[PDB]
Amino acid sequence: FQPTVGYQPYRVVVLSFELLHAPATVCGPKKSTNLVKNKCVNFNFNG
């Protein structure tokens, strides 16, 4: 741990997702889109 190839210290993180141990509460985002009106469109409002 002295300032300085297999001896090199490196910062490591592990991502383990406990998603099915309970109901989910953290999500990825969902990009929206500007709305148009008075035209036949395929709408998706909140699902």
Binding site: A22, P23, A24, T25
Partner: protein, 36 residues
């Protein structure tokens, strides 16, 4: 999902309660208790 509905108002008469809050806890619940 723990759901809480309420309404406060100035017992005979009819009143409908609005929802307030839902909590995604996933808890096994059996008992409740007051805090006076």
């Amino acid at each position: 999902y723990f759901k809480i509905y309420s309404k406060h108002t100035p017992p005979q008469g009819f009143s409908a309660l609005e929802p307030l809050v839902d909590l995604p806890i996933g808890i096994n619940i059996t008992r409740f208790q007051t805090l006076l």
